[PDB]
Amino acid sequence: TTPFGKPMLKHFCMNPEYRNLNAASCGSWPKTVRDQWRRYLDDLEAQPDYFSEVKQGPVIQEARREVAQLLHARVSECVFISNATTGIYTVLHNIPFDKDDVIITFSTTYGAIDNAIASMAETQPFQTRKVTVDLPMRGEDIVARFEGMVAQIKAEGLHPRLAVLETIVSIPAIRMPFESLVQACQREGVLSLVDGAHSIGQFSLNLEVLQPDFFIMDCHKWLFVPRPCAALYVPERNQHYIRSTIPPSFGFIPRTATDFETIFANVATQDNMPHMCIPTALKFRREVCGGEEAIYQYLRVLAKEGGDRVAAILGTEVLDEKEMRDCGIATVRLPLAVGPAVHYLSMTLAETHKTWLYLIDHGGYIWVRLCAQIYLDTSDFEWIGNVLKEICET
Amino acid sequence: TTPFGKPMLKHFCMNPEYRNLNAASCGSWPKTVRDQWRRYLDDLEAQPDYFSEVKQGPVIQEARREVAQLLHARVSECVFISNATTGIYTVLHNIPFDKDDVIITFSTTYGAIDNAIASMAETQPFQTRKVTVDLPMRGEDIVARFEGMVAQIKAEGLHPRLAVLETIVSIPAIRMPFESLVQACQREGVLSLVDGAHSIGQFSLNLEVLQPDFFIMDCHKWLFVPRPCAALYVPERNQHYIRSTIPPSFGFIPRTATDFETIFANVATQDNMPHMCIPTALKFRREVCGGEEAIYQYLRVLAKEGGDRVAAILGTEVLDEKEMRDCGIATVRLPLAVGPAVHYLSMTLAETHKTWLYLIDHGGYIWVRLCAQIYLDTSDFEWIGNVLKEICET
Ligand SMILES: *Cc1c(COP(=O)(O)O)cnc(C)c1O
Ligand SMILES: *Cc1c(COP(=O)(O)O)cnc(C)c1O
């Protein structure tokens, strides 16, 4: 109905002087979602205990049905949680680990996941090993080293029990061969904890075929809902491990919904408004945007072309292999070689240029994460490209 | 400026056909707070990454300063968390427990706290003992049994390490001698974890004199902010135990703000809007309500008189001792002696009578929790009293 690009800007609530090239952080949602937000806000204030005990429940169950459909998985396998950190931690904490189990990570593993595991080892006797990924790589070369580390764990007598994978590495942001890595995890009896914080709403996902052991994802990062909003997927063959939420509450389980579902329903006080907006956003995505596939192909090609376009203006490169760019994200190199410098950038991109990006010192050179969105156009990449060029020269 | 009672209703956003006798669940906030809420909502949608990285920080720090002042404690000792369950669990999880440490609870301890502790014992070797409180009691008789249990723990050779107290027992809701119990905890070297979920905004609190080892409280339950909103107080002499949030994130600590503060700042994605409204509510409470003390005395006397008034209509009693009613809560007995019955009540109080209460089968007789608020009047207690009487007879 509406074309992609700046014609979409009329359906979003962003200042015309604002260009959200970092939409996958706070999120970004259309006007029709905010309107729904305020109306639930209105209801909550009018009759608090009626909104919460009668009307709230149904909407959440619909949102679960729509997330489950978008993922090709049973609504009974999908549960709402506050954010990706809580869901990955919920899984890591329920699994009993032995003195001889090993948890495998990658140097790409999100930093908060490493802090989870380090803390778990203070009072639990398991151990850990990190697969060295120095980006760029080939997808297979990451799978190979992962194979090598499992083989070597079985050779020392220990037991490779679980591995933390990711779909999109946070930053430097690219797409990991998680399809291949889940299959590698299946062959050798290793639990595949997929950190798919960037997944739903950015590209297609079939959990029926992927069959991960656990799948966690942030809806607010790409599904046009506000932060915080995340969901957890656990197949039936694994729902027996999950016996408590984090923090524990009334649905705990000592050693017609299922018990698994009740665990994630009888929880402490939270605001389920972000989830209650999920339906509206999907409606918008179906009707105004021409369906999910339309949005995915646009996001990948914009990031493809807009990414190559920024690197041209700067004379640098977009992170790749020698497809890790099958996604609406382009990480570009910058003509650089400390933190007070990076600060200037930020507020020049903020008060001076009105926009916010995330940088990283990889390969000794600072990088930039460019987030595509259906309301951005290759000029806004040309625009930032020229903006970057300026601050760099200074 | 405005008198208490139904003249306040014009400053709140409750349906005139709604009587919130359960304000301490979802919360209840004035018009001036909602207006502030929507304006932050507006800002977040206009310039997402500028609202979050530049403007958000300052407001939260002011809110901490105002909570810390309302509690008589250093702003550096007070930190924002999502809800009371997460904060109590954050404390319980950071403290290393030995095979010979014992955690003490009471049959009044909130149910989600017991689930926390039970789960902790599956992988940690400590042990636990429960002080039997059969309400009604005298405050001293609860302190006595608590003394008895510590004496008996030291006699068996174990070490009383920590005790979970509460200010307001959830339901049947009364005030516990937590001042006395904190002093009992100090004398015998026992850590006093105060679950003060009902505390701030309901009655006066001085942490400088009380000196609890940990203090957790729900602002949204009485401080005219929306759910979820809670704060955690840890004195300096104890901030060394707290090395991670739950779930852990980037501020973790392996074995000019303080490290403690950074722990509760560098956290996963959350909405700090409830906290960012704290200032406005306090402004409202100072100006429209004539200060904090005005609100506390009104809440206690309304619950005092309105509670006695409901019990009169019903011919029953208000839970007490033979002051546990020094609070804006009255629990009344009902002329009863199962769950499908209680269901009818709910929707008759809901669709039929438009209001929601929490019942409990204590002393074999169902009880009712009456929550006073500055916008309620003794007629609304007379009103519910007559409503209760009717459904009871049927
Ligand atoms: C954003 C992100 C997270 C954490 O998401 P929260 O909502 O902050 O818990 C974790 N891992 C990766 C790779 C991410 O991109
Ligand atoms: C309300 C309450 C809690 C839990 O508060 P949440 O915000 O749901 O974590 C715990 N204990 C008591 C006594 C309460 O009244």
Side-chain angles (χ1 to χ4, degrees):
Chain A
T1 322
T2 287
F4 292 143
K6 267 145 178 178
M8 279 297 201
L9 256 294
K10 62 168 170 298
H11 289 135
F12 281 92
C13 336
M14 298 165 38
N15 271 353
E17 311 202 9
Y18 193 91
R19 318 160 270 269
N20 201 4
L21 287 79
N22 191 38
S25 281
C26 302
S28 66
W29 49 97
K31 274 211 180 243
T32 204
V33 159
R34 145 158 60 70
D35 305 6
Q36 186 59 66
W37 199 355
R38 312 268 173 143
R39 303 196 302 259
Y40 284 139
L41 248 333
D42 290 348
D43 199 359
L44 160 63
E45 302 168 334
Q47 28 178 23
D49 290 322
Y50 184 75
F51 173 71
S52 308
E53 300 309 69
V54 180
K55 288 196 138 265
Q56 201 166 27
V59 188
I60 307 176
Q61 281 304 137
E62 177 59 14
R64 295 181 54 202
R65 202 159 61 74
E66 313 211 7
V67 175
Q69 159 177 50
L70 201 49
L71 300 160
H72 307 206
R74 318 191 205 264
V75 50
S76 70
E77 313 189 318
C78 315
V79 293
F80 283 163
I81 45 161
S82 87
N83 45 64
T85 298
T86 298
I88 305 180
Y89 187 63
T90 299
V91 180
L92 284 176
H93 198 267
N94 276 279
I95 312 313
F97 286 114
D98 311 34
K99 335 253 166 192
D100 297 332
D101 284 350
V102 173
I103 299 180
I104 284 188
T105 63
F106 306 72
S107 32
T108 62
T109 296
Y110 194 68
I113 310 176
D114 276 300
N115 290 349
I117 284 168
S119 159
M120 298 203 54
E122 288 171 3
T123 90
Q124 250 272 23
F126 62 88
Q127 32 182 309
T128 179
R129 271 143 216 262
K130 175 174 305 305
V131 165
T132 310
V133 157
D134 225 301
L135 294 166
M137 285 224 210
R138 320 203 116 86
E140 74 192 342
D141 208 315
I142 289 145
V143 186
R145 299 199 190 180
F146 176 70
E147 306 283 23
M149 183 87 67
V150 171
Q152 164 60 14
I153 291 331
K154 313 193 80 185
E156 295 200 21
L158 302 165
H159 199 270
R161 180 84 147 104
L162 172 140
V164 186
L165 322 168
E166 319 91 23
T167 55
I168 289 322
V169 46
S170 45
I171 168 75
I174 67 197
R175 181 164 166 156
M176 298 283 288
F178 68 97
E179 310 92 350
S180 167
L181 288 176
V182 167
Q183 288 150 4
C185 285
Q186 183 44 273
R187 296 193 254 78
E188 304 305 82
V190 180
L191 284 167
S192 46
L193 206 161
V194 179
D195 165 32
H198 301 272
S199 85
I200 194 186
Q202 189 195 10
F203 45 85
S204 96
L205 203 30
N206 185 317
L207 297 169
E208 270 282 72
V209 317
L210 176 73
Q211 291 290 302
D213 294 291
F214 311 94
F215 198 87
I216 293 84
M217 50 206 183
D218 264 352
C219 305
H220 70 253
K221 284 201 166 145
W222 296 93
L223 212 68
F224 300 142
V225 290
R227 96 281 178 264
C229 185
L232 168 81
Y233 162 84
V234 190
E236 181 138 303
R237 86 180 162 284
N238 291 330
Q239 295 188 355
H240 69 273
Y241 294 102
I242 305 306
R243 308 166 38 241
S244 154
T245 55
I246 271 68
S249 154
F250 277 111
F252 165 82
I253 302 198
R255 277 180 320 198
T256 63
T258 182
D259 292 5
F260 178 72
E261 286 168 304
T262 72
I263 298 173
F264 296 87
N266 295 342
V267 314
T269 326
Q270 58 183 199
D271 192 43
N272 309 44
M273 228 88 70
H275 307 265
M276 291 169 27
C277 301
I278 275 176
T280 306
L282 272 60
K283 167 149 163 50
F284 168 92
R285 296 164 66 90
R286 258 175 313 189
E287 298 176 334
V288 170
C289 296
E292 287 291 325
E293 233 302 351
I295 309 182
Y296 302 161
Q297 199 208 103
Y298 182 61
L299 282 190
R300 77 162 145 260
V301 59
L302 183 65
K304 143 79 153 46
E305 282 164 329
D308 306 315
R309 204 46 206 83
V310 170
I313 293 263
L314 305 205
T316 38
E317 46 182 359
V318 188
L319 200 60
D320 206 9
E321 308 104 330
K322 70 89 148 173
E323 182 58 279
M324 290 163 28
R325 306 258 310 291
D326 188 354
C327 67
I329 276 286
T331 313
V332 196
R333 189 177 59 181
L334 281 66
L336 304 189
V338 193
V342 188
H343 177 161
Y344 175 69
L345 285 66
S346 323
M347 290 328 279
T348 58
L349 296 159
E351 174 180 352
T352 298
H353 298 115
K354 314 296 299 178
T355 194
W356 249 90
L357 283 315
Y358 286 167
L359 321 158
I360 186 49
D361 40 322
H362 195 90
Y365 313 154
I366 284 200
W367 291 83
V368 158
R369 200 183 66 168
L370 270 317
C371 309
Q373 249 303 334
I374 72 173
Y375 43 89
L376 297 208
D377 161 23
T378 166
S379 71
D380 295 308
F381 291 77
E382 285 255 308
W383 162 77
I384 175 60
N386 296 269
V387 170
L388 283 156
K389 160 188 212 174
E390 186 202 29
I391 322 307
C392 273
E393 300 176 14
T394 78
Chain B
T1 322
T2 287
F4 292 143
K6 267 145 178 178
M8 279 297 201
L9 256 294
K10 62 168 170 298
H11 289 135
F12 281 92
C13 336
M14 298 165 38
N15 271 353
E17 311 202 9
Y18 193 91
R19 318 160 270 269
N20 201 4
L21 287 79
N22 191 38
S25 281
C26 302
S28 66
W29 49 97
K31 274 211 180 243
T32 204
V33 159
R34 145 158 60 70
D35 305 6
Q36 186 59 66
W37 199 355
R38 312 268 173 143
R39 303 196 302 259
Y40 284 139
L41 248 333
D42 290 348
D43 199 359
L44 160 63
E45 302 168 334
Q47 28 178 23
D49 290 322
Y50 184 75
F51 173 71
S52 308
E53 300 309 69
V54 180
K55 288 196 138 265
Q56 201 166 27
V59 188
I60 307 176
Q61 281 304 137
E62 177 59 14
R64 295 181 54 202
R65 202 159 61 74
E66 313 211 7
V67 175
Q69 159 177 50
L70 201 49
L71 300 160
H72 307 206
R74 318 191 205 264
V75 50
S76 70
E77 313 189 318
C78 315
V79 293
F80 283 163
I81 45 161
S82 87
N83 45 64
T85 298
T86 298
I88 305 180
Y89 187 63
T90 299
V91 180
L92 284 176
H93 198 267
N94 276 279
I95 312 313
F97 286 114
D98 311 34
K99 335 253 166 192
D100 297 332
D101 284 350
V102 173
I103 299 180
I104 284 188
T105 63
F106 306 72
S107 32
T108 62
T109 296
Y110 194 68
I113 310 176
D114 276 300
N115 290 349
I117 284 168
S119 159
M120 298 203 54
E122 288 171 3
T123 90
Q124 250 272 23
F126 62 88
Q127 32 182 309
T128 179
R129 271 143 216 262
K130 175 174 305 305
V131 165
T132 310
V133 157
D134 225 301
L135 294 166
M137 285 224 210
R138 320 203 116 86
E140 74 192 342
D141 208 315
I142 289 145
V143 186
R145 299 199 190 180
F146 176 70
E147 306 283 23
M149 183 87 67
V150 171
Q152 164 60 14
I153 291 331
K154 313 193 80 185
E156 295 200 21
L158 302 165
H159 199 270
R161 180 84 147 104
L162 172 140
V164 186
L165 322 168
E166 319 91 23
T167 55
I168 289 322
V169 46
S170 45
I171 168 75
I174 67 197
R175 181 164 166 156
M176 298 283 288
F178 68 97
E179 310 92 350
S180 167
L181 288 176
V182 167
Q183 288 150 4
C185 285
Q186 183 44 273
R187 296 193 254 78
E188 304 305 82
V190 180
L191 284 167
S192 46
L193 206 161
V194 179
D195 165 32
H198 301 272
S199 85
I200 194 186
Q202 189 195 10
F203 45 85
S204 96
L205 203 30
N206 185 317
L207 297 169
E208 270 282 72
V209 317
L210 176 73
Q211 291 290 302
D213 294 291
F214 311 94
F215 198 87
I216 293 84
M217 50 206 183
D218 264 352
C219 305
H220 70 253
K221 284 201 166 145
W222 296 93
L223 212 68
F224 300 142
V225 290
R227 96 281 178 264
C229 185
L232 168 81
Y233 162 84
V234 190
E236 181 138 303
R237 86 180 162 284
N238 291 330
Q239 295 188 355
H240 69 273
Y241 294 102
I242 305 306
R243 308 166 38 241
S244 154
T245 55
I246 271 68
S249 154
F250 277 111
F252 165 82
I253 302 198
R255 277 180 320 198
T256 63
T258 182
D259 292 5
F260 178 72
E261 286 168 304
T262 72
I263 298 173
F264 296 87
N266 295 342
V267 314
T269 326
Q270 58 183 199
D271 192 43
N272 309 44
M273 228 88 70
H275 307 265
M276 291 169 27
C277 301
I278 275 176
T280 306
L282 272 60
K283 167 149 163 50
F284 168 92
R285 296 164 66 90
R286 258 175 313 189
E287 298 176 334
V288 170
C289 296
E292 287 291 325
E293 233 302 351
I295 309 182
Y296 302 161
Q297 199 208 103
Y298 182 61
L299 282 190
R300 77 162 145 260
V301 59
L302 183 65
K304 143 79 153 46
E305 282 164 329
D308 306 315
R309 204 46 206 83
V310 170
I313 293 263
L314 305 205
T316 38
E317 46 182 359
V318 188
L319 200 60
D320 206 9
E321 308 104 330
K322 70 89 148 173
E323 182 58 279
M324 290 163 28
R325 306 258 310 291
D326 188 354
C327 67
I329 276 286
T331 313
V332 196
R333 189 177 59 181
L334 281 66
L336 304 189
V338 193
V342 188
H343 177 161
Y344 175 69
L345 285 66
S346 323
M347 290 328 279
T348 58
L349 296 159
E351 174 180 352
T352 298
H353 298 115
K354 314 296 299 178
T355 194
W356 249 90
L357 283 315
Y358 286 167
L359 321 158
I360 186 49
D361 40 322
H362 195 90
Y365 313 154
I366 284 200
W367 291 83
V368 158
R369 200 183 66 168
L370 270 317
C371 309
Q373 249 303 334
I374 72 173
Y375 43 89
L376 297 208
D377 161 23
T378 166
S379 71
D380 295 308
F381 291 77
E382 285 255 308
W383 162 77
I384 175 60
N386 296 269
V387 170
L388 283 156
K389 160 188 212 174
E390 186 202 29
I391 322 307
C392 273
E393 300 176 14
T394 78

